[PDB]
PDB file of C-alpha atoms in Angstrom:
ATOM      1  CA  UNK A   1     192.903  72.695  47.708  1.00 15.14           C
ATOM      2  CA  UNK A   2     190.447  70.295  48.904  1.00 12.13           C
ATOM      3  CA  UNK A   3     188.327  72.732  50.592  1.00 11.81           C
ATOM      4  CA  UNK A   4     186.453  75.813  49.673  1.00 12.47           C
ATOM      5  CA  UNK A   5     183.396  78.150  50.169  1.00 12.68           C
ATOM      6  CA  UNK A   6     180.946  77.989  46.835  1.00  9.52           C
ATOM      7  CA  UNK A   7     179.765  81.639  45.865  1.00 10.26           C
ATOM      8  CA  UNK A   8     176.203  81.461  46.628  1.00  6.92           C
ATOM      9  CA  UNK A   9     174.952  84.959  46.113  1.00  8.91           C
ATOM     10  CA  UNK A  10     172.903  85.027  42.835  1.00  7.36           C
ATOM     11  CA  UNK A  11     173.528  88.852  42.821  1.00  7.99           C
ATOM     12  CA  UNK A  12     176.877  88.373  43.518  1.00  4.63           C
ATOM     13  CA  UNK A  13     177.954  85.766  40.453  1.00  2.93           C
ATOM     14  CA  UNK A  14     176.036  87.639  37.938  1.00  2.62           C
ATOM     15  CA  UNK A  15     177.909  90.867  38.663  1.00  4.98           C
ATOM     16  CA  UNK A  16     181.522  88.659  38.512  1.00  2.81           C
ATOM     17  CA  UNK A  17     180.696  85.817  36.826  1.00  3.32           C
ATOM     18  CA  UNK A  18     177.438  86.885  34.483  1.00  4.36           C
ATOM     19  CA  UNK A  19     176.369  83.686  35.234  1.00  3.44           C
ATOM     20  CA  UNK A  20     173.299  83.020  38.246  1.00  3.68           C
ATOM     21  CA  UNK A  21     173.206  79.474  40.324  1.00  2.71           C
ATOM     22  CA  UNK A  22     171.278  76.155  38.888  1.00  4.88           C
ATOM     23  CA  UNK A  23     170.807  74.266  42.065  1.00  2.00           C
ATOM     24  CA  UNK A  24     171.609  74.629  45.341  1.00  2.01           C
ATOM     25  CA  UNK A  25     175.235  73.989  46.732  1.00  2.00           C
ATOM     26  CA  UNK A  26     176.746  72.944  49.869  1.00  2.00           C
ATOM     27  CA  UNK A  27     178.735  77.044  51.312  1.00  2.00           C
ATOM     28  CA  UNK A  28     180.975  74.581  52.843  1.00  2.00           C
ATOM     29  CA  UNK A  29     182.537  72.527  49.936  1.00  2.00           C
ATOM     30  CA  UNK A  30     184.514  69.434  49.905  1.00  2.00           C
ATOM     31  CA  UNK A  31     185.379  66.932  47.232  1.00  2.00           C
ATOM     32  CA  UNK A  32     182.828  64.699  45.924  1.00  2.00           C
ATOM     33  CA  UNK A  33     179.729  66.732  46.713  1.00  2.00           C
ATOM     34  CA  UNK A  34     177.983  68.003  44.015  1.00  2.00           C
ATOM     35  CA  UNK A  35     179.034  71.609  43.395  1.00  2.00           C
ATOM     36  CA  UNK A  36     178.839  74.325  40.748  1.00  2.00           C
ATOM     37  CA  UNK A  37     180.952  75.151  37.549  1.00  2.00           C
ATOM     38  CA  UNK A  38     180.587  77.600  35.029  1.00  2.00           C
ATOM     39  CA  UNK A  39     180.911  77.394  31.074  1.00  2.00           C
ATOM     40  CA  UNK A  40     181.247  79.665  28.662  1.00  2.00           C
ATOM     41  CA  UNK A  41     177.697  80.912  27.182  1.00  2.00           C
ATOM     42  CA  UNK A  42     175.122  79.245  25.391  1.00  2.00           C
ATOM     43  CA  UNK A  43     168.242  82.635  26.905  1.00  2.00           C
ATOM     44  CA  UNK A  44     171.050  85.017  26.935  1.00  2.00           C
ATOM     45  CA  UNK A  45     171.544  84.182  30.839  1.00  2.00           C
ATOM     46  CA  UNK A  46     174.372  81.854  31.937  1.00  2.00           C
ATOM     47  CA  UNK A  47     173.767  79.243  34.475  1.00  2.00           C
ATOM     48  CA  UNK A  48     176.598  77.813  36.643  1.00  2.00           C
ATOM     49  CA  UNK A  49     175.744  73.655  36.107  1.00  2.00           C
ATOM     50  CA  UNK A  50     175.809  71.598  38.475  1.00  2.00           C
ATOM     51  CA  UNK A  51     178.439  68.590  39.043  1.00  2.00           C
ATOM     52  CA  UNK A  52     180.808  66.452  40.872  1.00  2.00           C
ATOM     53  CA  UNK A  53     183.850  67.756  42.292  1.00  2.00           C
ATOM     54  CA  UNK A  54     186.126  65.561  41.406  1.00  2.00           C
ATOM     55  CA  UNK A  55     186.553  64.191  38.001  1.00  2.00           C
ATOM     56  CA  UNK A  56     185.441  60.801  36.761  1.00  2.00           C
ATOM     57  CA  UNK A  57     187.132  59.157  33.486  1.00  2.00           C
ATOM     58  CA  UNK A  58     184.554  59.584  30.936  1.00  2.00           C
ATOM     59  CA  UNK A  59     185.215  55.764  29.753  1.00  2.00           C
ATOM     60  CA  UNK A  60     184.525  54.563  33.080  1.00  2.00           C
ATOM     61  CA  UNK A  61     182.034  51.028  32.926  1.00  2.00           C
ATOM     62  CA  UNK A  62     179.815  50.645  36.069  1.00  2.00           C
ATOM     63  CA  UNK A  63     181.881  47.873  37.487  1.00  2.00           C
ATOM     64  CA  UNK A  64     184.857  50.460  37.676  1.00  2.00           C
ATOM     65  CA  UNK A  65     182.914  53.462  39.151  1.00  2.00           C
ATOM     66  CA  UNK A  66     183.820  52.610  42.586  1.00  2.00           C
ATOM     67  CA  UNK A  67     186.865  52.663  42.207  1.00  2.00           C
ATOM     68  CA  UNK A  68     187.098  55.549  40.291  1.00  2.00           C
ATOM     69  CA  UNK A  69     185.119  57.582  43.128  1.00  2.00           C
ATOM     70  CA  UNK A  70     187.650  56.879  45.345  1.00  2.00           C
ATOM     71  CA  UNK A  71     190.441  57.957  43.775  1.00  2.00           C
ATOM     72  CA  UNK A  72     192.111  62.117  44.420  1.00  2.00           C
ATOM     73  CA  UNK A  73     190.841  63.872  41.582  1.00  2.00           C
ATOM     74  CA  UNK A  74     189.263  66.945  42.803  1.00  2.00           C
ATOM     75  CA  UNK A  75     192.516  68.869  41.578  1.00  2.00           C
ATOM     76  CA  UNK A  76     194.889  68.212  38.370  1.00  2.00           C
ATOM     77  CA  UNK A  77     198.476  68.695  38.176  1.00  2.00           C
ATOM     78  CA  UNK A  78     198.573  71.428  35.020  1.00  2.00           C
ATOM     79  CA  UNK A  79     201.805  69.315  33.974  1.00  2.00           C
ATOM     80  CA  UNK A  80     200.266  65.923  33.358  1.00  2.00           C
ATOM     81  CA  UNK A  81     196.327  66.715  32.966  1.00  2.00           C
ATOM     82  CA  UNK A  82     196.911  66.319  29.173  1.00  2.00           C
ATOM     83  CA  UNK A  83     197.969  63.206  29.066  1.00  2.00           C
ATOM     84  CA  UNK A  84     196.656  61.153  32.773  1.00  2.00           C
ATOM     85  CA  UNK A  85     193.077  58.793  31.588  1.00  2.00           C
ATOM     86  CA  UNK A  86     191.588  60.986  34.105  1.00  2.00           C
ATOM     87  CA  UNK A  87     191.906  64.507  32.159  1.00  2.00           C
ATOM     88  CA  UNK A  88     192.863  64.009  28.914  1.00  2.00           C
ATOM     89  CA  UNK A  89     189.752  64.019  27.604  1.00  2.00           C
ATOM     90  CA  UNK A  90     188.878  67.155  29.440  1.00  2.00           C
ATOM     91  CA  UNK A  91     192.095  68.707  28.341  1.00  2.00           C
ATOM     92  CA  UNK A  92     192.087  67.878  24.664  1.00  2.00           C
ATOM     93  CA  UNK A  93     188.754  69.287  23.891  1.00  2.00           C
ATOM     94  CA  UNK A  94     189.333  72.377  25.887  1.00  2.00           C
ATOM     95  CA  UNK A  95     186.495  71.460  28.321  1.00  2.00           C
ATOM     96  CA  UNK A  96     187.716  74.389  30.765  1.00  2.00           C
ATOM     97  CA  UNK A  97     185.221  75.797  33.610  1.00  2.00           C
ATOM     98  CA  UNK A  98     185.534  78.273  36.521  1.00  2.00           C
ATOM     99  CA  UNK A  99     184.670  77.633  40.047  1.00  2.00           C
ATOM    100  CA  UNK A 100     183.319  80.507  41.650  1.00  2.00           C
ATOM    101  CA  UNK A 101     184.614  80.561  45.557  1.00  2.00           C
ATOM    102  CA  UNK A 102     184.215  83.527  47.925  1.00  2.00           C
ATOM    103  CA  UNK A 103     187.015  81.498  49.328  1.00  2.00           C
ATOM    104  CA  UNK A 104     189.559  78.847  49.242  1.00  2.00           C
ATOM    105  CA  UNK A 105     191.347  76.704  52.195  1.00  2.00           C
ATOM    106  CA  UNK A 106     194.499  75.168  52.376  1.00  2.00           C
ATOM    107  CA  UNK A 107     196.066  73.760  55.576  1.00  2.00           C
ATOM    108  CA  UNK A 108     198.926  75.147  57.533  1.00  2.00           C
ATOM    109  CA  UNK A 109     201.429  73.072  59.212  1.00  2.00           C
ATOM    110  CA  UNK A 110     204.039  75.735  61.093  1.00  2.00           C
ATOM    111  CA  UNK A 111     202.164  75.176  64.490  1.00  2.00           C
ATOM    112  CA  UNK A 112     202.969  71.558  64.396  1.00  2.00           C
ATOM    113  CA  UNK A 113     199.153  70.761  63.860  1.00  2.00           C
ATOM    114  CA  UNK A 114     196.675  71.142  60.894  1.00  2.00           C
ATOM    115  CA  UNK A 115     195.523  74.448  61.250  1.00  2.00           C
ATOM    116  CA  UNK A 116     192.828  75.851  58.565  1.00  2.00           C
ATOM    117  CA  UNK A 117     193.461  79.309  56.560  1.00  2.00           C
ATOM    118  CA  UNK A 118     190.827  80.961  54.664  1.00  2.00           C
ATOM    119  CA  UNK A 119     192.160  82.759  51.425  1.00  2.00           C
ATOM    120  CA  UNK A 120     190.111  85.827  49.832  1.00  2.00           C
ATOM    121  CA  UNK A 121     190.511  88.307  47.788  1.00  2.00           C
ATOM    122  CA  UNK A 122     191.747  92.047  49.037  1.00  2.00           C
ATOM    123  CA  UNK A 123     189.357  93.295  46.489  1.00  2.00           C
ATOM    124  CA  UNK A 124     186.799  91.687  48.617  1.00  2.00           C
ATOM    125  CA  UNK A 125     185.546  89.992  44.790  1.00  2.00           C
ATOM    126  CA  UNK A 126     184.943  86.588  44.743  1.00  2.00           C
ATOM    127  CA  UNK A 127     187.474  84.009  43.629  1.00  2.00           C
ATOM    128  CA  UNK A 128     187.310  82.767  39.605  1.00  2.00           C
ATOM    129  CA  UNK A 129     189.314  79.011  39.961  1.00  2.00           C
ATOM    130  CA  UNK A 130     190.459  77.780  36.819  1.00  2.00           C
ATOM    131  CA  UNK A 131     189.332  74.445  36.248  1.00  2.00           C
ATOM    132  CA  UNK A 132     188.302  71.600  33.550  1.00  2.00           C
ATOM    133  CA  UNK A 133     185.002  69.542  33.603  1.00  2.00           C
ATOM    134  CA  UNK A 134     183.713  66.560  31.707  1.00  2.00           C
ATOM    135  CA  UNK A 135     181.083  63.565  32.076  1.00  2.00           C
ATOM    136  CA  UNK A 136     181.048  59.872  33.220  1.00  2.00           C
ATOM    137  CA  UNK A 137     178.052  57.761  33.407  1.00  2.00           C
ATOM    138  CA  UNK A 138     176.642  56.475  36.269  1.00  2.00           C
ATOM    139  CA  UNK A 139     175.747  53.037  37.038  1.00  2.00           C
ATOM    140  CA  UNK A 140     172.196  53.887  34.912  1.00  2.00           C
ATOM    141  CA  UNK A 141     173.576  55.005  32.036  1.00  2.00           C
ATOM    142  CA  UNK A 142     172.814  58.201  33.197  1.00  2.00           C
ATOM    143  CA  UNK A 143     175.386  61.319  31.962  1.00  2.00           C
ATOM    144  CA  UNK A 144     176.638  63.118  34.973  1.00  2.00           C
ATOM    145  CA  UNK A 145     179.219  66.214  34.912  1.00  2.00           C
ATOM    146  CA  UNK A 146     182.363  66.475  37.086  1.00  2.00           C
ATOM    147  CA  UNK A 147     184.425  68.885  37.165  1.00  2.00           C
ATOM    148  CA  UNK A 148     188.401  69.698  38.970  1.00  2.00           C
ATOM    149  CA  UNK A 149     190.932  72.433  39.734  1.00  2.00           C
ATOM    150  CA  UNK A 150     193.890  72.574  37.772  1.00  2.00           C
ATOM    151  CA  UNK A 151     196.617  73.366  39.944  1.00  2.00           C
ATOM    152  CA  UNK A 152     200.268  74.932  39.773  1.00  2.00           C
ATOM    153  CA  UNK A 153     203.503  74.125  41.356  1.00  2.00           C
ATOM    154  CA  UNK A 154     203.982  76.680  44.445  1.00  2.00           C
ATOM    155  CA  UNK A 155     207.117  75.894  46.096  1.00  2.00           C
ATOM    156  CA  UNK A 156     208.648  79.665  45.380  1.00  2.00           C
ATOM    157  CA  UNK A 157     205.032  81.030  45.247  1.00  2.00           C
ATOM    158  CA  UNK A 158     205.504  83.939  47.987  1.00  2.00           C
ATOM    159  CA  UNK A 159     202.086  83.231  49.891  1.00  2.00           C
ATOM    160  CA  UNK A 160     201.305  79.608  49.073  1.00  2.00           C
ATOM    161  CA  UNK A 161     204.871  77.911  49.598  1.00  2.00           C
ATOM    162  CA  UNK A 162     204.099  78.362  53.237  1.00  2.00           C
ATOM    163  CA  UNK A 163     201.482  76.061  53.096  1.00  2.00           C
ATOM    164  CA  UNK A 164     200.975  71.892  53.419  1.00  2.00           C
ATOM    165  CA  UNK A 165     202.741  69.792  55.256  1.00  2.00           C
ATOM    166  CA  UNK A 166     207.029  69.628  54.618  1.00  2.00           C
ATOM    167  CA  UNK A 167     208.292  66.399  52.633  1.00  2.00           C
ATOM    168  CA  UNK A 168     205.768  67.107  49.504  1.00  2.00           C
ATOM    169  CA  UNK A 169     205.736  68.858  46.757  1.00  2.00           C
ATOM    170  CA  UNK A 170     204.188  72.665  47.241  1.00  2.00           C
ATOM    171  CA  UNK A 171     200.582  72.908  44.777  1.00  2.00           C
ATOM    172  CA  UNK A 172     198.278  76.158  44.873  1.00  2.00           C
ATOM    173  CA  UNK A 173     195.012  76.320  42.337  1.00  2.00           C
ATOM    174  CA  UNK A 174     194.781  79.100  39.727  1.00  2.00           C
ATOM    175  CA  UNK A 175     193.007  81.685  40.749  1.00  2.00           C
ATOM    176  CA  UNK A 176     192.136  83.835  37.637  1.00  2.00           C
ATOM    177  CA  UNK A 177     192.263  87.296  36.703  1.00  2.00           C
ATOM    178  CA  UNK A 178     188.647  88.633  35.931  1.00  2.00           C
ATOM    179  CA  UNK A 179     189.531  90.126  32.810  1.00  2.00           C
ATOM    180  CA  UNK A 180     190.690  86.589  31.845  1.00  2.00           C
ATOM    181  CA  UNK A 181     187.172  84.584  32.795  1.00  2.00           C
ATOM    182  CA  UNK A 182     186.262  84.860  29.138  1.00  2.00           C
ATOM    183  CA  UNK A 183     189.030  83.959  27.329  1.00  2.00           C
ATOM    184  CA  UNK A 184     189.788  81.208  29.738  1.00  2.00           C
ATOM    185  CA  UNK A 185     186.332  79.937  28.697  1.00  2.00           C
ATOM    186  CA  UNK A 186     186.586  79.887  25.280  1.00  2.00           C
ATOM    187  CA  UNK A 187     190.685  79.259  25.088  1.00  2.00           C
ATOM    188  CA  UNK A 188     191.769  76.176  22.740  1.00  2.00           C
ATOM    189  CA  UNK A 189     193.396  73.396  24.258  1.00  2.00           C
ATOM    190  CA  UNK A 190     196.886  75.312  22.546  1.00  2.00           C
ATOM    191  CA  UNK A 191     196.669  77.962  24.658  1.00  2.00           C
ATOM    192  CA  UNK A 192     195.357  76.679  28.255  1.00  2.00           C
ATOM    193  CA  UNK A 193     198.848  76.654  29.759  1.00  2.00           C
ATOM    194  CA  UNK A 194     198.672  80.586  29.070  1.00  2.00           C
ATOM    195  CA  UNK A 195     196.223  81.332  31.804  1.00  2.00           C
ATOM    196  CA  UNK A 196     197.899  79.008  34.349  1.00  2.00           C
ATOM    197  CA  UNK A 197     199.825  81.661  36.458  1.00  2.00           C
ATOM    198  CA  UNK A 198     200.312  82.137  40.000  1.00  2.00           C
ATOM    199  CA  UNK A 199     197.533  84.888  40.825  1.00  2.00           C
ATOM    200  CA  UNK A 200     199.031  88.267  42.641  1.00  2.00           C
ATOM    201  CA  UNK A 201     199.825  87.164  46.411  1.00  2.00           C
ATOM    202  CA  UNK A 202     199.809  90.609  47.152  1.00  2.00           C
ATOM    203  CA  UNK A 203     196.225  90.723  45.917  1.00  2.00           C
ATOM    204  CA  UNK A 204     195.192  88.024  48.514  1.00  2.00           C
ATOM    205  CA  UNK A 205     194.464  87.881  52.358  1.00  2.00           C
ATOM    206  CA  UNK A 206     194.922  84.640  55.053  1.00  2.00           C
ATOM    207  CA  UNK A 207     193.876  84.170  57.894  1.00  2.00           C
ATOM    208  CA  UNK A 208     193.561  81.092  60.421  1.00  2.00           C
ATOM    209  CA  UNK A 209     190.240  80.096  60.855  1.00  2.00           C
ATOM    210  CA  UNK A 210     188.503  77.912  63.173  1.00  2.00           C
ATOM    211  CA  UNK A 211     186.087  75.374  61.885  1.00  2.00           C
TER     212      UNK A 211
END
């Protein structure tokens, strides 16, 4: 997923998420804008922070940061984010964080031509994505926060292995159960690969959209 809409609605993510928006987000969401990620707690009153989508190494000098920008990190394959330079860190301290979404686009190849679909929840409840975030400096010194999706294999996932173009492996992100947003929060770095699950397909909804 390199593509999403940001849950906006301060009503809306305190209900779901007990958490209300820091700064203002792009609705639209792509990688590398700044976007919002929440943490678990602690003014008893979460606040989703604000960061990058799309990791940075934490070690990362100034004369590397360019390059690092550049390279796909706005998701994590669950298999290897423990040990790639990228998400180690991250992983290893148990830096985990949940992207709120109302929704969630991946691309859809069957008509011979990228065509976007918008996935939500039947529920009509916002998406939780299970995610990791960490910090890199910038070329000041300054500490900035970035954050990624950790994502699943979906080739013989019964909604998502319909999706992305043929010749490539099949991913889909980890949409979380709400009665897991807490412990996913909180979980040790032992038990992480717990909550990565394919969510319900019969608890979500596509449809082709036109941007």
């Amino acid at each position: 997923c390199s593509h999403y809409q940001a849950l906006k609605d301060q009503e809306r993510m305190r209900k779901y998420f007990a958490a209300h928006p820091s700064a203002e987000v792009p609705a639209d969401m792509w990688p590398r804008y700044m976007g919002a990620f929440i943490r678990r707690p602690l003014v008893p009153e979460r606040e989703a922070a604000t960061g990058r989508w799309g990791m940075i190494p934490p070690g990362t000098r100034p004369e590397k940061l360019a390059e690092a920008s550049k390279k796909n990190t706005s998701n994590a394959r669950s298999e290897t984010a423990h040990q790639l330079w990228t998400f180690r860190n991250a992983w290893a301290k148990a830096q985990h964080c949940i992207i709120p979404a109302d929704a969630i686009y991946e691309p859809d190849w069957r008509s011979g031509k990228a065509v976007p679909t918008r996935f939500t929840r039947a529920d009509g409840a916002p998406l939780g994505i299970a995610g990791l975030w960490d910090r890199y400096r910038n070329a000041a010194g300054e500490w900035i926060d970035s954050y990624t999706m950790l994502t699943i294999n979906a080739d013989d996932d019964p909604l998502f292995r319909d999706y992305h173009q043929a010749g490539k492996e099949k991913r889909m992100v980890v949409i979380l159960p709400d009665g897991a947003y807490g412990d996913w929060l909180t979980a040790p770095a032992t038990d992480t690969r717990d909550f990565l699950l394919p969510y319900p397909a019969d608890r979500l909804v596509a449809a082709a959209v036109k941007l």
